[PDB]
Design a protein around this ligand. Sequence first.
Ligand code: NI
Ligand code: NI
Ligand code: NI
Ligand code: NI
Lengths: 140, 140, 837, 837
Amino acid sequence: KLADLVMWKPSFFGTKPEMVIKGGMVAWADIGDPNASIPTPEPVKMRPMYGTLGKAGGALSIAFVSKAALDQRVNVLYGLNKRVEAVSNVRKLTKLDMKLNDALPEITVDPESYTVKADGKLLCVSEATTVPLSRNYFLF
Amino acid sequence: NKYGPTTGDKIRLGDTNLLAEIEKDYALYGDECVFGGGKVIRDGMGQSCGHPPAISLDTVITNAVIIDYTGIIKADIGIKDGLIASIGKAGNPDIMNGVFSNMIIGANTEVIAGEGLIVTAGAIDCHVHYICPQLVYEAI
Amino acid sequence: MKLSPREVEKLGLHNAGYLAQKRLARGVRLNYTEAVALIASQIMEYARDGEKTVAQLMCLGQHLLGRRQVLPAVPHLLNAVQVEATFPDGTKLVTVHDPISRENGELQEALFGSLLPVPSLDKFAEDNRIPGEILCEDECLTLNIGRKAVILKVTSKGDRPIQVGSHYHFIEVNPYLTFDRRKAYGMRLNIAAGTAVRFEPGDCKSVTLVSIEGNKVIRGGNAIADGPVNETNLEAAMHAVRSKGFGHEEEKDASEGFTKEDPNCPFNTFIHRKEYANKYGPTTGDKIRLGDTNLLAEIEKDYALYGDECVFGGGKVIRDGMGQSCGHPPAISLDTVITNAVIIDYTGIIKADIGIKDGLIASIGKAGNPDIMNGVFSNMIIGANTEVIAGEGLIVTAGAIDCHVHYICPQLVYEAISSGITTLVGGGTGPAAGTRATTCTPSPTQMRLMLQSTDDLPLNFGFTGKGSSSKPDELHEIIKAGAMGLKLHEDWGSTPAAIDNCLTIAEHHDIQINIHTDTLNEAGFVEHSIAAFKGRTIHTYHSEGAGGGHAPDIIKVCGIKNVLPSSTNPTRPLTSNTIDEHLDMLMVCHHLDREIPEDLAFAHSRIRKKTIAAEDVLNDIGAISIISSDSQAMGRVGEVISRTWQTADKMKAQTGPLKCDSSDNDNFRIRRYIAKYTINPAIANGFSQYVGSVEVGKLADLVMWKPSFFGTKPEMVIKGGMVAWADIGDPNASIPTPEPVKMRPMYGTLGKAGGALSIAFVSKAALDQRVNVLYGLNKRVEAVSNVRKLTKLDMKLNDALPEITVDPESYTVKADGKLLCVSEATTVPLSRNYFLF
Amino acid sequence: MKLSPREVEKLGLHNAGYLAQKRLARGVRLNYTEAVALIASQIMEYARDGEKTVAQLMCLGQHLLGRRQVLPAVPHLLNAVQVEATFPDGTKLVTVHDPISRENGELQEALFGSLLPVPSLDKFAEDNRIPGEILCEDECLTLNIGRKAVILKVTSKGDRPIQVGSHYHFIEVNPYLTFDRRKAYGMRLNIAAGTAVRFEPGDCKSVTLVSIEGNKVIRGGNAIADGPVNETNLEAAMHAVRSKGFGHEEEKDASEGFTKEDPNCPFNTFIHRKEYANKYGPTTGDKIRLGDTNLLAEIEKDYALYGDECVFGGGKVIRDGMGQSCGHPPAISLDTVITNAVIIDYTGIIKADIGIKDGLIASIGKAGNPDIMNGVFSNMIIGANTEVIAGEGLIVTAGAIDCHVHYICPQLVYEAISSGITTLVGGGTGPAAGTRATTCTPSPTQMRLMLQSTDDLPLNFGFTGKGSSSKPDELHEIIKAGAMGLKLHEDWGSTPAAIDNCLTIAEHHDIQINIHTDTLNEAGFVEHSIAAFKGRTIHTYHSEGAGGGHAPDIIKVCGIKNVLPSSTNPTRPLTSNTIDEHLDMLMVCHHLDREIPEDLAFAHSRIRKKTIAAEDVLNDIGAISIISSDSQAMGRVGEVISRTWQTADKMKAQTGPLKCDSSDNDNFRIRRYIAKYTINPAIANGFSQYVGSVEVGKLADLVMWKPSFFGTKPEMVIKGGMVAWADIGDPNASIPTPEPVKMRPMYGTLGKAGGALSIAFVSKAALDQRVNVLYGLNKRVEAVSNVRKLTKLDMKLNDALPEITVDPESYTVKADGKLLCVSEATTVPLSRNYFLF
Ligand code: NI
Ligand code: NI
Ligand code: NI
Ligand code: NI
């Protein structure tokens, strides 16, 4: 598969990644003062890297289209530099093809109370007063 | 104060203790190429109207103090096809002496006013780590 | 064998020569083409034998064919035969001058090396034209009138010959010529433009000089008197003369005066019309026979100023400071100038120089250098960066436009341009049955493919989709894809429902609709199809009907105002073999059986001598506005032009001059007919602002013709200002004229040059879509337009709208109640005198 | 007919055959080309009859033509005739070996199927060369000297034949061969490179082996002894031998020693020079006759190490681990290697392998595999990714450079490359009158169009503008547009004012100026034009004058230091037909009349036997530095090379060896002349660092020639390292040699390959403008340079500067007071023996 990968520090996992690799090349990454002797001094911000300049972006990615469009060679017609591939195998799929999320409970919803049940069991969950990956990381 | 210094004058580089002395000047006092309303670079005057179209400079940098390892001089700089076409006294040979065929200011010539300024070659950094594109911007 | 290209070529030439020898052997009187092939091949054979020298063959070549062994026109057409061959001392060029010099040739020599039996002289069985002959009044023209003049004695003090051209600044001549330099200042020789005067060492000749004109600025030469003619520069010049040692001797009593329109004036130089025409082509009043037809074109006007003709060559007019300007800005120099061209266009028959700039016709008039010539406008300046195409003695016309093309194969494209066609409009995708029957490029993918396929070909192209549908849906798509028009064809269904829908689509997209009606009268008769038009503009293909259409009266459309009618060329004109040929062509193409009465009835209802005869007349009176091919689908792509002229020729022969014709020439008929394959086709299809005529601003799609071969085989085809195809001989030859001379593709056909010289015409919807970008086309793309408000009245010189009737039983056709009778021709010009087969 | 390409081709072959039959029928002694055509055509006819088998025709084909029915050289040139035809049992290949085997052929058979009368034998009328013959001293060469050697008995225990090649690692051979594997370690057969030894089942033969050299690394085979030759690997190898069951038997007393330069040494393998030359082409000391001329080229040196020749083929040297390296980095493998080439270049006549990399000549020397061969440098390594062009027996030269080209039509480009020309310099826009007369591409739009037009053609191109102007303005523009030079022509005006201005422009742009002077002496005599040069560098076209120039002494320029003089080819060399041919060529091209004394006087003043004769001598002594065509404008594009050699041939025949020539060969004269169409043209135009000679770093534009056809018809033309054109036969044939064999375009001419293999030369102003980008050119573009400081002294081997005088009345020419007399040749080589016509 394409080398579209994201690097994370465990302490910042799920919130702010270190770098985003697109098609094997760094597309975006945390970098500080560009005039600095090293790349870590402030201000450190997520910034576009070489994968975003010139036509590099297209060489690292794919524009997904239908097979009719590819048969038409829209990639040529439109003068696209980005690689183009057709989507496929989506008409024989069922919930069972969803990896680790193939549950098919019988859902009912009370018309008046809106109470929801899965296979006759109540789906109760109190509201959270706080969530992680928030206050510890964002400026605003 | 009008055309930048000439032979013998000295210029302090920034707020350093270094003094650069103009070693020579290609100008002929009185025929300086100065652009502006009622000034020298105008049709039939400092701007030639009797030479072939093809030899008009693309751009002329007027009255520049040049600091280069080859010397510190005062001269006009002619640019053609993105290259340094000439260094010396620019203008119109129809009314000025000392204007060679490669330093003619014509109708199709742009003007960059160098009077009072120092011109140097663009710097060349040969130990660059292409860590991020932002340092390229900082560099130029 | 390790055969080089030229050897392969020469083998072909030999083959043609052998064919000619076999024909000669049975007593055939050879035509121009066969005579050339035979003579050139014989020269090669004698060279192979190694027993004859170049000088000997220049002589033997004149004894091969006599007047009795060739057609009457041959002695007139055949000035010389050239060919190179490998002699014992290498490759040598041999030119046989005036080959037909005797009554009977030495046939054993004509057949040398063929092993064919020599025929007895009685085997060659015994007043026609001089093809392309020029007719001039017995009169002289006066050169350089209205100028100051002087006669000076010029003595040569050199030990080598000195020759001076007509437009050389006389004071600038070789220092070894002695004469009064002061009197020569600002003057030039008063002699025919392009000629010179020769001074052998020690010679002294009196010469007449005339003042230069225009801005009167001297430039070039020895830079003795550079600058505007005036007192100050004269003195500077004389100082240079003495200083540099240029021969000078005052001639105090040299006769001085002015040139004028006076036969008695001693300073004048005269030239007979005959010699003038032989040098620069004819001028006002002269007449030219078009090919071997009976048509005579008269020069209506000439922009030249006698004496200042632009002639290129050694010692001639187009040289630095002389005819070639040296005092104008670089940007305004013409890219190319066609000098002394006889222009035949529907707008008139004139004599003029043609200026080309950026692939467009920049100007028509008097070209040259305004520094020494009068009447040279800023847009006709010949400069250092100007190329020269010599038009003197030739006819120039707009490139032909065939608008009924079936893109069955690419080879017919080559045949088309080699005949003088530079624009093609039709439909097709190759030899598929659909295309073999109709001018349709059905799908958007084939539209894209055909546009990409022909993108490097040096011709303008227009593709039409299939309009035979009762719904607009698919029509919008093919038009958006690039179609510049639509074809309604009975094979796809030409019913009232389809006709109406198609025309409604046309009203919205501003494209022309071409139609091949319901021959079977299945959904209705001709009046019903016309009703379906609902007064909307439509182009009826092969309106006579042999090519298809309501039987037997489709020709009635020629009298309908909103109809732009065209005819295809196989029925042009009605000749002895026409009916038999067409009847069988039809049945073979529809797989019909003569023995089946139904099939025969159908065939006879569609191939009618009466409607074809009427078509001759209708074309002549301007009731049919266009002539097209219907290439390889009941039509010949290389005969759109010749067929047009053969029709005009036949009509003149049988009915005489047209009402609007003068009786001293056939200019009107000529203009009416040339409009049929040039301007009218462009107007009907919506791109008349780009091509269709020799007018300023339009593309420089031009064809050069020798009068003797006009309407049959052109000299060269210019596309977008560059030569695309042209007659050229042996590529290894020392010159470009030796055999075999064939029409060949030139630089305009290599790489992507073709696209840079042409236009792919599409609909405005397609251009809005930018299909040119989407398809990666290199050829320029423009949208067709202004085709929905056209009527027969917009067809140039072919706006006749007679009421046509057709007798249901006899098929007798009448125009406004008058019979359209014309006997069939037993022969036609532009045929036997020119083709090998 | 539904004719396939091959059927059309075979019809052409038959036509050539019939031509040959008719010639034979009248008693003509056929040349090589005609003999092949006739024999091949007859084989096809007999096959059509279906009465003869392949075996029968292999025999009948030898009885068709006898020695008496063909030219004397034919029996030498004609080794075999091949052709395929449809027999009753399908298509079959027939090879007629040594067809000329009898005194008289069975002419009824030679004429079979032609219906031509059989000529009596007396009709064929009765000491010349062996074209391309190799001359060798009666001597033997010693192979693989200085190596360890051993003689071993090898027994086959297999039931099938086993054959081993010269460079196969012996210990790696078939396990069914039994011998002392330990002694064979690191050794190979001491036999002629490319040969083998065959072992029939049960056979036992003693063979001499020699040690491999270079790095001495074994690779490939059965991987028995892979690795560097040493004690440790030997033991590992013997263990593998025993372990895997490879036949091994110790031969304790096998004779061992070393090979040396000793005729008595028992381990040596010798080969006579005759057989060596027949296998690998000649070596040092041998001489080769160029075509059927009288010139003999002697190999000055050979980079080969006898025994290690790179020969490709089954069981030969260029195979994995053997001659083909298997131990170097991928990136340094040559793209292509031309093996055993006899190189003829102005820098010398040598024998060597030629390495090609990235379209450039990467190396010249000894190629191969350094793992087993000595003397193979890192830049001449043959690897897995290396293609092989077999040069053994052939001559390789740089592609020719024609610098006086009129781009009149594209067909002459094809003729040019098919003859050995890979670079064209000149001007034109197609067949326009301007171009037909001068080498000028006038406008920037035509400059762009011509560059785009020729962009896919596999030749380097240089276009020149019109320099005939007294102002610099327009010249700057055409140069900026892409012109790499300018042409001053009298037809546009070659006056002192224009000459001076043009040269001033040249000094600024660093481009060369080519000039056709004022033949009419209108503005001055030759001394005045020379004065106008003001000592500046200029190239004088056709310096002799027949092609144009001050009458009658333009040839004086050959003695001017700042003049780089060239000649055009129709006057090369002076022969019996030259004068008559040229006189008429001139008058026909200028429309002159013999009956008009002025016209005749002009013609006689320009076509002079005396100056043409002088031109022969001036070229011979190096006073004229270049030979060009003047294609279709008084010149033949396909004869730049042949004419050069015919001149050298004539001069040797009439004056003998040159002063600087050795008397055992004509190497110096050969080098002097080849420089005329290779290096000199490139130096004069400013691109000698790219092409012009067979030297490392330059483009691999090379031509392969068979000695017998040298100077006339090459085998293949390599452009930028890829075959552009080559001799190839019937494309449907089982092999590439059967008839018809013709020069044909190869893969280097398809798609955009042509541009990838070539360079479009432009001015530095144009490159600064990036016209390559602006014009969308795929072909590489480089700027010309270093042409303004050149003098006659910079013309390689043609730097002679004699003082030339021309008698004003007699036209007698003298060099330093000495007469330049040379009688006209009645015949020339490189002609009758090769061309069909
Ligand atoms: Ni039709
Ligand atoms: Ni049709
Ligand atoms: Ni010339
Ligand atoms: Ni020339």
